[PDB]
Amino acid sequence: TRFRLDNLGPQPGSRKKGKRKGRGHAAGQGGSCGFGMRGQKSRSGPGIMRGFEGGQMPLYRR
C-alpha cells in the first residue's frame, strides 16, 4: 500500500511542541520561568481576582 504506518506524519504548523519552562536559559524562558523577580504574580497559588484593582473601587462597583 502507498500509505503505511511508517510513512505518515502531521501537517506542518498543526502540532507545536509546547514550552517546558524551567529547563535552562537557552530554551528561552529562563530559570525564573518568565515571571521576573519576586512578587505576587510569581507565587505558587491563586492570584488576584479578575477585576481587582489593588483596593481601588473596581469598575463593577462604581
Residues near RNA (CB under 7 A) are 20, 22-28, 30-33, 38-43, 45-46, 48, 52-56
Of 12 and 55, CB closest to Mg ion:
55
| Residues 58, 62: Cα–Cα separation, whole Å | 7
52 binds, among RNA, Mg ion, none (CB under 5 to 8 A by kind): RNA
Please report, as a single letter, which amino acid is at residue 2.
R
User: Can residue 31 be called a binding residue for Mg ion (CB under 5 A)?
Assistant: yes
CB of 15 to RNA, least distance (A): 16
- Here the cell at position 5 is 504506518
Q: Sign of dihedral through CA atoms 53, 55, 61, 62?
A: negative
